[PDB]
Amino acid sequence: TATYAQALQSVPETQVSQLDNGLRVASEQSSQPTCTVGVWIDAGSRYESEKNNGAGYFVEHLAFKGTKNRPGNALEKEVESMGAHLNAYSTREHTAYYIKALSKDLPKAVELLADIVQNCSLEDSQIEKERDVILQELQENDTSMRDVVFNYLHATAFQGTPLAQSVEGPSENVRKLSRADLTEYLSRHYKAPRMVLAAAGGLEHRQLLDLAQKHFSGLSGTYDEDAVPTLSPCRFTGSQICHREDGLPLAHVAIAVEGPGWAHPDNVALQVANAIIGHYDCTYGGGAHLSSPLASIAATNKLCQSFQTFNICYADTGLLGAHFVCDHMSIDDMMFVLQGQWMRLCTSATESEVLRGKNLLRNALVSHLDGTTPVCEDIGRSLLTYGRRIPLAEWESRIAEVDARVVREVCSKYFYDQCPAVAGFGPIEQLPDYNRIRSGMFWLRF
């Protein structure tokens, strides 16, 4: 026999370790076959200037196409013949490259990764070949309402800030982008301490630490002169951006109220809140009996196609809200239920309801961690986000302090009397007037 709590405390702790330059080493052991080693660099889109707005994202197309040591397709051939997978993901705050690989393959794994980060053989040919590709990706991203809309959100809740730029970047910055510019970018932002070398699975921390090729370090200050925040707050703005295209079959709406940085007691309590509203799709098997009202109403009244609440967490900024796709004629009704669910939440939460969401949270936050890749990303990202802690067993505790009054008071900071960030890609003809969505965040009636 064994009980949830117990299991919790029994989980392999994460070992954080440092090289001389600030290279961060972490790892969670299991003595299992496969391993996912990763280098989680934290110089994202938000450091880009208007020109290099898509810089980083451009580097990512070159990351895997050559090192001075390993030319044209020498990287791929190497990974492949091992049976290892190599992925590169980029965010507005975090770039990361990782490898999935047999545990015995660390040797040439970690070498590869390291290599990748540092030496990237980038010829004029590869630059002009990537351009064309990027320009073609851009065109394809315009084919995705959800991606089109979420960008919009950011741009309008971040209007007038570095953070509001697409990670994909400006069309024509791809055309223009000087070859010299990727260098300065990399050179200036890939310098650890930023970087973290993380990993999970069957490895021994001891060896990870050692394996780390100590080749280049942080060429930066020893004092406060550096302390000028490169992470300067980004002004919060509640505006809407309404891009109406009656040509399109459905309507995407992303509505948000600015939120806490990555670390904050209010930041877990929020989650528990969204557990309650939940998320819903044409294909949920419960429909009408699902315990979250927006879902039930939706399910019942054919109100919407799909809807999800989110919590986007940045160091100085946060996007909170949900997002619903709904026929041209149902934009207002779903707005009404949603906002309605928010207000009800900060005034009438009931312990039952908050206790169910609570438990949902735990699961969502345990099940994610199933698999090697998962764990690795939590460990890597966790270190630039929340610093060098791994709050995994704490969570249950923190999640445990949750009370219906805690949930209520935390939700009221952020939603109540606050000014929304709303964007849509019409049929938005029926989308509520900004003032109407505004007055939706306080309770006279409705």
Partner: peptide
């Protein structure tokens, strides 16, 4: 829940209203 404290300030408003207004 919040209804007592809200019903109590709604209570008060009516009262002060009458009192004054009347």
């Amino acid at each position: 829940r919040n209804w007592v404290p809200t019903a109590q300030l709604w209570g008060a408003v009516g009262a002060v209203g009458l009192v004054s207004a009347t």
